[PDB]
């Protein structure tokens, strides 16, 4: 006898991550760089939910 | 006897990630670079839910 | 005796990812580059849900 | 005795990905480049759900 | 006899992370660099919930 | 200027495995049952290297 | 200028494993049952290197 | 200028394991049952290196 | 200028393990049951290196 | 200028373990049960190095 049961909104589970010998050089001038986005949820009832964004200027 | 049961909105599960010897050089001037987006959900009731976006200018 | 049961909206599950020795050089000037988009869901009730987008200018 | 049961809207499952020794050089000036789009679903009740888009200008 | 039960809004669980010998040089002048985003949720009832964002200027 | 270089003897690499909802009942009396053999190498300089073997009697 | 370089004897690497909702009943009387063999190497200079073996009797 | 370099004998690396809701009943009388063998190497210079073995009797 | 360098004998590294809601009933009478073998190496210069073995009798 | 350098014999490193809500009932009469073997190495210069073994009788 349920009403609104076992709900799941914006969920992540069961994540396993391994990284041995990654080399990662980066060089930038006046930009916007993004790496390394792992295992992120969110909720946004009124708004823009952005992840991994980059605008060199406005 | 359910009402709105076992719902799943915006979900990820059962993720396994391995990365041994990736080399990744990057060079940029006035741009917008994005890598490494792994295992991300979200919800957005009113708005633009963007992931991995890049605008050099506006 | 169900009402709206076992629903699944915007779902990903059962993902396995391996990457041994990928070399990836990138060079950019005033652009918008995107790689590495893995295992992402979302929901968007009112809005533009964009993934892996790139506009050099506006 | 079901009403709206075992529904699946915008789903992906059972994905396996391997990548050994891919070399990938990229060079760009004032463009919009996209690679690496893997295993992404979404829902969009009112809006344009775009994936892997690129507009050099507007 | 439930009313609004077992709800989960903006959740992450079951995360395991390993990193052996990653070298990561970074060089920047007047930009905005982001790496190392792991295992973060949030909720946002009225506002823009952004993660891993970078704007060289405004 | 190599002598015996980049050798690989008895190797496996780049394996990805997914298994969603497999049911597997087994019943046995005085036998020898084997399932679930995944991603195994070995070397054997002097001997019988057997994998997934079953002898009800001797 | 190498002598016996980059050798690899009995190796496994780059393994990713997912298992969601496997049911597995087993029943046995006087047998020998084996499941769940994942990601195992070995070396054996003098002997029988066996994996996943089952002999009801001898 | 190497002599016996970068050797690897009996190795495993880069393993990621996920298991959500596996049910596993087992029943046995006078047998030998084995499950759950994950990520094991070994070396054996003089002897029988066995893994996941089961002999109801001898 | 090496002599016997960077050797690795019987090694495991880069292991990540997740287990959410596994139910596991077991029942036995006069047997030998084994589960849960994770991330174990060994060396054995003179002898039988066995892992996950079960003999109901001898 | 090395002699027997960077050696590694019987090693484990980089282990991460999570376990949320595992139920595990066990019942036994005159047997030998083993679970929960995680992250164990050893060396054995003269002898049998056994892990996770079970003999109901001898």
Numbering used by the authors:
A (entry chain B), B (entry chain A), C (entry chain H), D (entry chain G), E (entry chain C), F (entry chain I), ...: 38 to 95
What's the publication's text?
Parkinson’s disease (PD) is a neurodegenerative disorder characterized by the presence of Lewy bodies (LB) and Lewy neurites (LN). Spillantini et al. (1997) identified fibrils formed by the presynaptic protein alpha-synuclein (α-Syn, 140 residues, ~14 kD) as the main component of these human brain inclusions. In vivo studies investigating α-Syn aggregation demonstrated that activation of the inflammasome and more specifically caspase-1, the enzymatic component of the inflammasome, leads to the production of an α-Syn fragment truncated at aspartic acid 121 (D121). This C-terminally-truncated α-Syn form (α-Syn(1-121)) aggregates more rapidly than full-length α-Syn (including disease-associated mutants), and its production is associated with cell toxicity.
Here, we report the atomic structure of α-Syn(1-121) fibrils determined by cryo-electron microscopy (cryo-EM). Helical image processing of recorded cryo-EM movies produced a 3D reconstruction of the α-Syn(1-121) fibril at an overall resolution of 3.4 Å. The quality of the EM map allowed an atomic model of the region between residues L38 and V95 to be built. The β-strands β2-β7 wind around a hydrophobic intra-molecular core composed of only alanine and valine residues and one isoleucine (i.e. V48, V49, V52, A53, V55, V63, A69, V70, V71, V74, A76, V77, A78, I88, A89, A90, A91). The less well defined β1 and β8 strands are attached to the core, while the first 37 N-terminal residues and the last ~20 C-terminal residues of α-Syn(1-121) are not visible in the 3D reconstruction, indicating a disordered structure in line with quenched hydrogen/deuterium exchange – solution-state NMR (H/D exchange NMR) and limited proteolysis, which showed these terminal segments to be unprotected in nature. Two β-sheets (one from each protofilament) interact at the fibril core via a hydrophobic steric zipper-geometry comprised of β-strand β3 (i.e. residues G51-A56). The side chains of residues A53 and V55 form the inter-molecular surface contributing to the interface between the two protofilaments, which is further stabilized by a surface-exposed salt bridge between E57 and H50 that might be sensitive to pH, as an unprotected histidine has a pK of ~6.2. Our 3D map suggests structural contributions of some familial mutations to fibril stability, since H50, G51 and A53 are all involved in the inter-molecular contact between the two β-sheets from adjacent protofilaments at the core of the here studied α-Syn(1-121) fibrils. However, in our cryo-EM structure, S87 faces the outside of the fibril and hence remains accessible for disease-associated modification in α-Syn fibrils. Instead, our cryo-EM structure reveals that the PreNAC is responsible for the interaction between protofilaments, and places the NACore at the very center (i.e.the core) of a single protofilament.
